Amino acid sequence: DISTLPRVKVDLVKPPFVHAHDQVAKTGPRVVEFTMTIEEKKLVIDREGTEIHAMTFNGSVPGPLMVVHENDYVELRLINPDTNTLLHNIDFHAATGALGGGALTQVNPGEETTLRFKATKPGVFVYHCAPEGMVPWHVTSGMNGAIMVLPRDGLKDEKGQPLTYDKIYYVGEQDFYVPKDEAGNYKKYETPGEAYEDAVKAMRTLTPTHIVFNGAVGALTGDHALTAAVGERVLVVHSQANRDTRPHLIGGHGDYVWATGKFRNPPDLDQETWLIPGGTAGAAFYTFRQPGVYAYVNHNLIEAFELGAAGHFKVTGEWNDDLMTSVVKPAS
Amino acid sequence: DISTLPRVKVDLVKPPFVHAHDQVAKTGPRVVEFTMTIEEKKLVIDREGTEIHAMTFNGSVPGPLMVVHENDYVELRLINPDTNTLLHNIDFHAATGALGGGALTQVNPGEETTLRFKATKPGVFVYHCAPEGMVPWHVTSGMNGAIMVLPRDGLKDEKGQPLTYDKIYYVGEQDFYVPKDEAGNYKKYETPGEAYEDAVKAMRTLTPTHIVFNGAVGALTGDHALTAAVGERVLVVHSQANRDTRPHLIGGHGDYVWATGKFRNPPDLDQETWLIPGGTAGAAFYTFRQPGVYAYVNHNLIEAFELGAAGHFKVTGEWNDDLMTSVVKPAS
Amino acid sequence: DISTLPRVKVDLVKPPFVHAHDQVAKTGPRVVEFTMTIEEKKLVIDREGTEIHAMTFNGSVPGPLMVVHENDYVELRLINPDTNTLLHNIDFHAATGALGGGALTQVNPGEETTLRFKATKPGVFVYHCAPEGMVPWHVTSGMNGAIMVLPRDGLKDEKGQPLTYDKIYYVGEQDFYVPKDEAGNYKKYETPGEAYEDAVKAMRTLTPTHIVFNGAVGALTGDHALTAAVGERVLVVHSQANRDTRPHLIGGHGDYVWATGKFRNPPDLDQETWLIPGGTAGAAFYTFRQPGVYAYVNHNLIEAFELGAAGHFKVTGEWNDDLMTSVVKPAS
Ligand SMILES: [Cu+2]
Ligand SMILES: [Cu+2]
Ligand SMILES: [Cu+2]
Ligand SMILES: [Cu+2]
Ligand SMILES: [Cu+2]
Ligand SMILES: [Cu+2]
Incomplete structure (x- = not known):
């Protein structure tokens, strides 16, 4: 009842x-x-x-x-x-x-x-x-x-041990199809009804004009960068309602990834990049090991760096020279 | 012998x-x-x-x-x-x-x-x-x-228990690349040899003009909708010989999914959408829990609703208000 | 230290x-x-x-x-x-x-x-x-x-038994976006700086002009075909830094596949085609069972056979008529 x-x-x-x-x-x-x-x-x-x-x-x-x-x-x-x-x-x-x-x-x-x-x-x-x-x-x-x-008993790893996150972020990735004229400039519309057939035409090209995180190019950058600290366990939920995406944390990994988002399945381990199909949400768990700036991107790098599908994490803490170091800094 | x-x-x-x-x-x-x-x-x-x-x-x-x-x-x-x-x-x-x-x-x-x-x-x-x-x-x-x-001993779930389907359907998804003139109308051809170079040109755009189930827009609708009853276990086999697809049962799930189609592997559980790569067949098992119309789509929704990659299931039986109900029907 | x-x-x-x-x-x-x-x-x-x-x-x-x-x-x-x-x-x-x-x-x-x-x-x-x-x-x-x-203890199968390869090949798949003029011919450039904006424009179409293995159309064919013998265990590593691919061995399988490339995960078994997301490397293990020519392709067959994403294996050894035979050869 x-x-x-x-x-x-x-x-x-x-x-x-x-x-x-x-x-x-x-x-x-x-x-x-x-x-x-x-x-x-x-x-x-x-x-x-x-x-x-x-x-x-x-x-x-x-x-x-x-x-x-x-x-x-x-x-x-x-x-x-x-x-x-x-x-x-x-x-x-x-x-x-x-x-x-x-x-x-x-x-x-x-x-x-x-x-x-x-x-x-x-x-x-x-x-x-x-x-x-x-x-x-x-x-x-x-x-x-x-x-x-x-x-009800929270997330578990591939062996059935608990995975507990300290922080969670939600990255929604949006594909926009802004209608273009034949010269390639974006068209602008007086009513939804007047925009509709051109919206349909733009969609039919199957080529997004923009692919963005949190609604705009650069939305997750600067003062709005994602944050973490070395040693923090972070869950990033990522959705794409219409088009496949392939998230990647530049400088990191998906330690535990549910690429198609369903927690009854064991996660994939140690992922560099994962495929979230259009119409799906996925979730990736990572424990930061190094400070600095990370870029979180769709790893079609054209979609990331030309069409907008890139955000930043700013991570605080101690640098680990065992994991990475410059032996000889760039020089002549 | x-x-x-x-x-x-x-x-x-x-x-x-x-x-x-x-x-x-x-x-x-x-x-x-x-x-x-x-x-x-x-x-x-x-x-x-x-x-x-x-x-x-x-x-x-x-x-x-x-x-x-x-x-x-x-x-x-x-x-x-x-x-x-x-x-x-x-x-x-x-x-x-x-x-x-x-x-x-x-x-x-x-x-x-x-x-x-x-x-x-x-x-x-x-x-x-x-x-x-x-x-x-x-x-x-x-x-x-x-x-x-x-x-030889039939399908099994992730724990090795039998999965037996009551009904099976085969959804073939076809990407067509109908040649277009520069105005965007489909061209029509007198011989296969005369069509060939334009077919190649159309394919090279990598943008299908049509993506259909069972050979035509709306083929799996109306009198040709797929059918089931509440409580029936249905296996849907889905193939795409050339291009990735992402099936989704609108209102349902893939309870057990072999997205790349190979039964020696444990199925993925509770899928919303699954990725079947081009050149692959996949199979999804679902037990219907609610009556009514379902749409089975490629969840690039442009491909589904503009290019043709959508069919219907009509499911008979009893509505379960515990699983879903309208509390307050749309009103002013 | x-x-x-x-x-x-x-x-x-x-x-x-x-x-x-x-x-x-x-x-x-x-x-x-x-x-x-x-x-x-x-x-x-x-x-x-x-x-x-x-x-x-x-x-x-x-x-x-x-x-x-x-x-x-x-x-x-x-x-x-x-x-x-x-x-x-x-x-x-x-x-x-x-x-x-x-x-x-x-x-x-x-x-x-x-x-x-x-x-x-x-x-x-x-x-x-x-x-x-x-x-x-x-x-x-x-x-x-x-x-x-x-x-450190080498590759393992889904049950934890060793998988040892006899041969390893690396197939890098490259998407090129060669700028085109409005007639569709490739443009040619005097300096990198003068090419840049047109390179960006070409990339933004999200439609590669060429998709090649080992740097060129046909690079893995002829005298440069991949080789194996019946009974040899071969690991093919396949990468794509920017765009999804779907490898397929025509006439064979991926016996054990790590589609997203990470060996702590159990491999997928018996794959026909596997999806390697853009920005990922994958690895497939196969034991050849039949001699002859195999084609190794991206199974978007347009990308394979029109845009260049196809190579060959030449396999030596004995034909197994139990696995495949022509019963009645093509005839009137
Ligand atoms: Cu709405
Ligand atoms: Cu949906
Ligand atoms: Cu034919
Ligand atoms: Cu094939
Ligand atoms: Cu460089
Ligand atoms: Cu990268």
Whole structure:
């Protein structure tokens, strides 16, 4: 009887941060209540000032990471304010039935809905908007995020020993398909309906114009670089709702990686680069061993360094000359 | 001595259906006899009426699924009728030697050949035509299928317990590269030889114009939707002879997935989306838990919803409100 | 104390060959000394005579395979002769810290540097040049290779039994993005600086013009085909520094495959095709069972047969008619 279960309301946070949670379940199964408000907004996605009409969950690309435990119930109140122009919904890859909830959550502007589903499978999973006839447009406009369903006894390694993270970050990778004129400049549009056929044409090329982390070129750099300390165990959750990606920590590794994100499977060990298929979330665990700057990239290096799929970690602590040293510094 | 083994003749069926077979071998090793007739034919592949010259095994794209057990012999009689215009052959990824049989099966129109090979490795495997100098043209014109080699004691889960399916479907995913003029309209051709250089040019773009299941946009929808009942265990075999794909059951999961199709390996559990590399067949097992419509898609959603890589399951049975429910239906 | 360890100097060889090494470590940990000299040179990459300005480690594309054991130290002297024009460096995916060494190895023409790192994780790993602001240009101009870090007790199968190879080959797969004019012909450039923006434009299309093994179309064919004998156990290491690939041995299999290259993980068994993500090296082990010609390809068959990603094995020995035979040779 679900009415007899504890309810807990979660207040979500902006990626790449993640709301507070317990890795090992400190309660029995609960109904975990989330609220997200859809926001259609202009977003500047690159250094040139290219501005698109983004479709977001909770004002961000990606949408926030939701975190529950296996066999919790997820209850989501989805709000589509009358300041928006489009119909939206939500599909959870974690859920079973009704197109992941999409069939039950169609909200016109000025409407809201509440969906409840049982999180029966542990893993990281994509969620995204999926309105009938317009699915890839919404998804490639930013309307996706992820949900992590932790095993009730937390994460385990390939031998069944606990893996406990000290920090968790969520990197949502977004492929945008900004329509171009024949000279190659980005086109700009007066209404969503007037943009639609050109959006479809741009998507059909299958060639993204931008591939970004946390919604824009350089979003995870500078004052917004990810941080860690030598010796800290960090879990990076990475999602891509539409297109394959291949994350790589430049200077590091994925010590334990669930490339397709599902925690009943033993992790892959010692990965340099891992493939997260389009429509999947993955998770990588690493213990930092050296200080300094790391780049976290999609290792199609064109996608990383020309199209935007690169962020930074800044790591504090002691340098280990046993692991790496310059013997002879560059010289004539 | 192969002459002392039982022979069994199989009558193949059109995808997505699969010929009758036993999951657990009820006989010792056998010579399993198949016959396929090559058919070059016009096929309408989309809702616009785009018509291509398809090259098929047995009149279908994909070719039929063949099913044998490990250490059976597969004996194929391949017929190229004099009504065809091209040289064809067959390469089995399940076979060992002679380019998978391709070197031994070159049949001009009006010729036939019979190949026998030992199915030494259990899994789902691609087969395709591969004529010297013309390989990707034949494959991307539809001339591919798959063969399933079951373990003699049937499928097993990650712990070695039996997995028995109630139903099996074969989804062949086909990438077509229809030549376009500079305005972007599809070109139409008077002879294969006159089409060839433009086919090569179109392929070289590496951008398919269509990506379809069972040979056409919408082929697995409507009266031809896949079916199941709540509680039925379904195995979906999925092949792609040329290009990576990422299957996803919208509203469901891959409970047990062999993404690269080889049954000596433990399956991946609880998958949302799985990556089947180009030139591979994969297999996913799911037990339906909810009724209604499911979409089975390539989760590059542009490929699914704009280029054609989407089918439907219609599932009968009882709705489970514990797994999913609308708490508050969409309202103002 | 690293000064108390044995030092061993390795003399590298040109791919696809690999320098001599022991699979099982016959000494304790060592400092393994390598030297590579950067060479910028013109390379003809296709049958049409398309000539690019390649950037190489040691004069080859790919760079040579380095082979050490887990917990050895790798000491590399990198030389950038004054006959080159560009700044280069080296990033090892096997290393920990300083962007894989890239931050410590920036060498202008006329400079050299020596880097030492501890090879703490067993596997095959990519190395590549990665100069700040120019990374994908150098990598896609050929400046990448791989390093194999063997477990001290050699390779093991999924049950922990030894796997010993008789022969090893290194196949580096290179994606080139040769700039094209609007008619589609390759453009040719007077200086690197004058080529740069067009190189960037070509890369941004995300569509390689050439995808080659060992630096050119047909490099691993004819007198340079890979060789083996029936019954020989062969390990093929395959890297791709920028783009996903899907190797396949036509007529064979990957008996044991580490698709993402890391030997602490059990191998995948009986693979037809495997996915090596961009920025990764993988390794496949096969025991030949049939003589003749095999094709080793990227199984996007357009990439293989139109863009160049195909090589040959020539295998000597006895034909096994039990595994495959022509029953009825092609006839009217
Ligand atoms: Cu939406
Ligand atoms: Cu989805
Ligand atoms: Cu053919
Ligand atoms: Cu093939
Ligand atoms: Cu360089
Ligand atoms: Cu790298």
